[PDB]
Amino acid sequence: VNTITFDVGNATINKYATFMESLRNEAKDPTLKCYGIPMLPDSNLTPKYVLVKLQDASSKTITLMLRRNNLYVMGYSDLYNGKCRYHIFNDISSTESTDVENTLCPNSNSREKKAINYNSQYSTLQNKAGVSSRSQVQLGIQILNSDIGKISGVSTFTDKTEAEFLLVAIQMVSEAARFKYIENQVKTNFNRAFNPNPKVLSLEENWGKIALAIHNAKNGALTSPLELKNADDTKWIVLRVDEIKPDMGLLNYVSGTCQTT
Numbered sequence: 257v258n259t260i261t262f263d264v265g266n267a268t269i270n271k272y273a274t275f276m277e278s279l280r281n282e283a284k285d286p287t288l289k290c291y292g293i294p295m296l297p298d299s300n301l302t303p304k305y306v307l308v309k310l311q312d313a314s315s316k317t318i319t320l321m322l323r324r325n326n327l328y329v330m331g332y333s334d335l336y337n338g339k340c341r342y343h344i345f346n347d348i349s350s351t352e353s354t355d356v357e358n359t360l361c362p363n364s365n366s367r368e369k370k371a372i373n374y375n376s377q378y379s380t381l382q383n384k385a386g387v388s389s390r391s392q393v394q395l396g397i398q399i400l401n402s403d404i405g406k407i408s409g410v411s412t413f414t415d416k417t418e419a420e421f422l423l424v425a426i427q428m429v430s431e432a433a434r435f436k437y438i439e440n441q442v443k444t445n446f447n448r449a450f451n452p453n454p455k456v457l458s459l460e461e462n463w464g465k466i467a468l469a470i471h472n473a474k475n476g477a478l479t480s481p482l483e484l485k486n487a488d489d490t491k492w493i494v495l496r497v498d499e500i501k502p503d504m505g506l507l508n509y510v511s512g513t514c515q516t517t
């Protein structure tokens with residue numbers, strides 16, 4: 257399994273772009289694509305995981321573990337009290353949990369369990385963060401940096417603190433890798449906090465449906481309209497691959513052949 261490092265504490269737009277490039281290039285299947293857009297592999301291709309190490313301004317780190325097949329964050333690790341501490345979501349199976357344990361913290365003689373005692377759905381994370389919408393949880397480079405320092409090497413912390421960190425890291429890492437539009441929202445706002453707009457949220461919520469729509473399209477025409485949101489919360493009725501492709505970083509895995517370019 258590869259570990260890709262992103263230096264949050266000394267970040268620049270260019271360094272974030274390179275991070276996104278490296279993460280997409282590691283995660284993607286070596287060959288699968290539809291309409292020129294790289295696709296994630298089946299669940300059997302090895303390595304099955306990618307690690308993402310986030311470094312703050314004091315060189316504290318948190319390492320996220322991502323599933324390659326769907327880019328979900330499965331859990332994360334930090335160094336505390338001389339040990340590797342692994343924090344796994346509670347909706348990960350026993351088999352995958354064993355992988356997470358041993359991939360984040362291969363030294364079984366110096367590690368510690370500190371579970372994430374809730375599941376990894378956005379509805380749950382929002383509940384734990386106290387917000388009715390993750391539009392209300394700002395994203396940003398300084399926020400991500402600050403959040404790392406509230407958790408890494410910290411014995412005990414609240415579920416709210418953790419969920420806020422997870423919302424920010426999931427969106428700035430996995431969702432940005434999935435969607436060039438979201439990468440670009442981070443880059444346009446690189447120097448400030450920002451609230452994810454309706455188009456960010458819509459893309460996040462519809463990634464699986466978008467992959468299927470692109471995979472199924474014939475001669476660039478979607479088989480049925482795909483309704484998303486524009487950034488002003490108006491409806492975006494997508495009819496062709498041409499309209500959605502610029503926003504895409506990675507397609508979710510979809511079995512079967514497609515129009516490849």
Ligand SMILES: Nc1ncnc2[nH]cnc12
Nearest residue numbers: 327328329376377378430
């Ligand atoms: N834990 C997670 N990781 C990646 N994408 C997600 N979408 C919702 N929860 C997520």
